[PDB]
Amino acid sequence: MQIFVKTLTGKTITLEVEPSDTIENVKAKIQDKEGIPPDQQRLIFAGKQLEDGRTLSDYNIQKESTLHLVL
């Protein structure tokens, strides 16, 4: 399942994840490709703030959904 995360410049990167993944796992991936540690990562989907702990399937992250990354 391919998810995209988008910065405030419009720049997007692609991540290969599963619905069972939690936001911690994602934040670690983002840290691998862009270097930002999960402390300073704040992810948002559908205007909801997303917290490390619940999973993609709980926030209803589907096949090619796009998340917002901010610091």
Binding site: F4, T9, G10, T12, T14, E34, I36, E64, T66
Partner: protein, 518 residues
Amino acid sequence: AKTIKATGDGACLFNAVSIGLSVEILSGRLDSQLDTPGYQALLDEFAKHHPQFNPKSWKTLKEWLAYYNDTRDIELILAPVLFNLNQKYQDHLDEEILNELTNLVWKNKANIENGQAWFQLQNTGDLGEALFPKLENLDLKKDRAPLLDKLREILKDYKLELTRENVKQFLTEKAKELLSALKKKISSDPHAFQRGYSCDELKGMTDALAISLVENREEDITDNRIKIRLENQEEHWNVLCNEDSERFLDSTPSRLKMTSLEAYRGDKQVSAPTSEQLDLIEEPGVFLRERTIDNPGLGNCAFYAFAIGLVNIIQEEAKYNRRTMFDRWVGLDRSISGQYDEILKLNLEDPDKELLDRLQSSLRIVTYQYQIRELRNVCVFRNGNYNRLTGNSNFVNFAALYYGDPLDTDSRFNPFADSVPILIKMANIDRDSVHPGHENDVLVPLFLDLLYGDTTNPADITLETEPKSDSPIITAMNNITQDFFWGTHLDLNYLAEAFEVNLHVLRNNSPIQEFVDI
């Protein structure tokens, strides 16, 4: 006005323009521009991306768009074509990179010298603008952090005051090469379609297509060209469309299973609508010329020649941003995974001997696998005629040992050549009892014997019966992967099937006649 959402892979501008442009082409309102150079360029780029676009024309463009009606289908078909055509309209790249670099230094020289990481730098200007997006998109580890190092290193000579005009001047003096290298890295970015895009970055193409991109309702009533209305909320592009949206979009479900990246690489051919036929004129082809063992010319082996053909297809495909052949090759042999740049770099007039040795080894392994799969398959019992076995290239090679002809038992060309066990077995054959035209009465049960063992009956060989672990047939088969095995067109046939390429074999004296064609 209804709003159509576009997927957010980062090329949302190209997806949105793809959707709106599709509505405009299907509506008929752009037929007058069919002949204009912009839309001829569009049909050309479309053809370069989709090999099954046979009648390369407006009618079949409309046919594809009406067929692949779903908007995601449309994006996969057309957003890479539009992304490709846009590159043909980039004038100021040099100025663009230089300016992005002066932005990066001028707002973070302090941060650059203090060892700040890339995510810590200021990438946004006072107006909300993005300061250096093209650089921003490059890989952090391979390019961005080393960029910070090279910049800190160069900045020792910066003894003027920290002003933008200063930084620009200094950079044109002391970072000439740095800028050159970065221009190469940006124009080669494998994920450039995912960095953000503003409307005006497409202007040269939109102008050439007689189309105005209208952003967030900010219209210019003086502009009377046909308009694609775009909507940007939260750094994402969507399409407005008026009666039209229902008429030309999402009438059918999504037919393509393709990732954005695979589409831009053109990894799998989009299949043409059923009303059209394949030309196959332009199917990828390898063109070879037999020289004889007596007069070998430069004496290349079959795998060398074939590998050169593949490499040529690779580079030619890179010309229009497709990595099709290469990604197929990696599909067949993971060890090729990281040689795309090394393959594009290969000089075909003096090719790099070691990398070519690697590709030849790959080809020998691929054809070994395919050849033995074909062996097992061909040995499944169908008929007492064994019509598939006695035609199997490798079985014919095995049988060539019987006729003793030295031309058909060359170690360079026949993997079974000097199989001591096989030749013993065939020394124990009453050849008087063997009448001409019936040698296979003995050779077929012998072969199967050596392949699966005396125990099993030829009539019972299915796809599950495993070859003898000790089978001398398999070990003679293993020579295909050996340097001293030159190979023949026989071995290259399996490769033609594996890389989905058309193999053409000139004879040494075959003539070629030129002619004008469309």
